[PDB]
């Protein structure tokens, strides 16, 4: 029964998911002055040319674009990672207002939204096994600021009318996730967690320094989605972000 409201939101999650107060929770504030350049970090390798998108789903918390991860088609390698991580889904977190919506912050700055490209370590064989390992997932996080339209986002924006409510899905084949990336792959990296229940501590976070720009009309369309199911009272899907969590005994490393 978790969500983002006063009564079921992030301040409540620890009662069902005690790891909410754990040692490696996400997101965090990235203090750009404290993050250390790690000259031994490799360039990220983002290999999305064979990505096979299947479906888009309103899960009552966000919308997920899901990929065929039955083989090594779209993978993330390099940077801080050992081995091959397969793309399984992406989703966003966003705000009711342009001044909030991101989960990570940069020197306490909040962006309008944040894109999460979720990958799993193929050495664990399936996604459900991967989330029970400390190096099971790699999530590529990309900030969204409101400015110019992102052309490669518009196919996603166009289909949101067809998945307005919780449990609706639509076929979403032949979507190229390369169109959501900024020019630069400079990043920050730290060990953390899923930012939604069950809050598992299985994620290597890779957060790109360069935001992408989306238009006010693009993010407006995200805010027309509904948290509720069809035939239930309308609740706009806005402010589906977890606030920054204590850094505790962690260092954020910069690739640049
Ligand atoms: Zn996320």
From Swiss-Prot:
Q: What is the effect of changing residue 59 to H?
A: Reduced proton transfer
Q: What is the effect of changing residue 114 to Q?
A: Strongly reduced activity and sulfonamide affinity
Q: What is its main location?
A: cytoplasm
Q: Which residues bind substrate?
A: 195-196
**Residues annotated as the enzyme's active site:** 61
Cofactor: how and how many bound: Zinc. Can also use cobalt(II) with lower efficiency, but not copper(II), nickel(II) and manganese(II).
Query: What is the regulation of this protein's activity?
Result: Activated by X-ray, histamine, L-adrenaline, L- and D-phenylalanine, L- and D-histidine, L-His-OMe and beta-Ala-His (carnosine).
Cofactor names: Zn(2+); Co(2+)
- What happens when you mutate residue 91 to C/D/E/N/Q? Strongly reduced CO(2) hydrase and p-nitrophenyl acetate esterase activities, impaired stability of zinc binding
Give the consequence of mutating residue 116 to D/N/Q: Reduced activity
Q: Name one GO cellular component term.
A: plasma membrane
Relate the outcome reported for changing residue 61 to W. Answer: Impaired activity, rescued by 4-methylimidazole (4-MI). Impaired activity, not rescued by 4-methylimidazole (4-MI)
Outcome of mutating residue 139 to G, per the record? Weakly impaired activity
Q: Name one GO molecular function term.
A: zinc ion binding
Q: Which residues form the Alpha-carbonic anhydrase domain?
A: 1-256
Annotated site residue numbers, Involved in the binding of some activators, including histamine and L-histidine: 89
How does the activity vary with pH? Optimum pH is 6-8.
- InterPro entries reported for this sequence: CA_dom (IPR001148), CA_dom_sf (IPR036398), Carbonic_anhydrase_a-class (IPR023561), Carbonic_anhydrase_a-class_CS (IPR018338)
SMART domains per the record? Carb_anhydrase
Q: Which cysteines are joined by disulfide bonds?
A: none
Q: Where does Zn(2+) bind?
A: 91, 93, 116
Protein function: Catalyzes the reversible hydration of carbon dioxide. Can also hydrate cyanamide to urea. Stimulates the chloride-bicarbonate exchange activity of SLC26A6. Essential for bone resorption and osteoclast differentiation. Involved in the regulation of fluid secretion into the anterior chamber of the eye. Contributes to intracellular pH regulation in the duodenal upper villous epithelium during proton-coupled peptide absorption.
The UniProt entry's sequence similarity note says: Belongs to the alpha-carbonic anhydrase family.
- What disorder is listed for this protein? Osteopetrosis, autosomal recessive 3: A rare genetic disease characterized by abnormally dense bone, due to defective resorption of immature bone. Osteopetrosis occurs in two forms: a severe autosomal recessive form occurring in utero, infancy, or childhood, and a benign autosomal dominant form occurring in adolescence or adulthood. Recessive osteopetrosis commonly manifests in early infancy with macrocephaly, feeding difficulties, evolving blindness and deafness, bone marrow failure, severe anemia, and hepatosplenomegaly.
Its recorded name reads Carbonic anhydrase 2
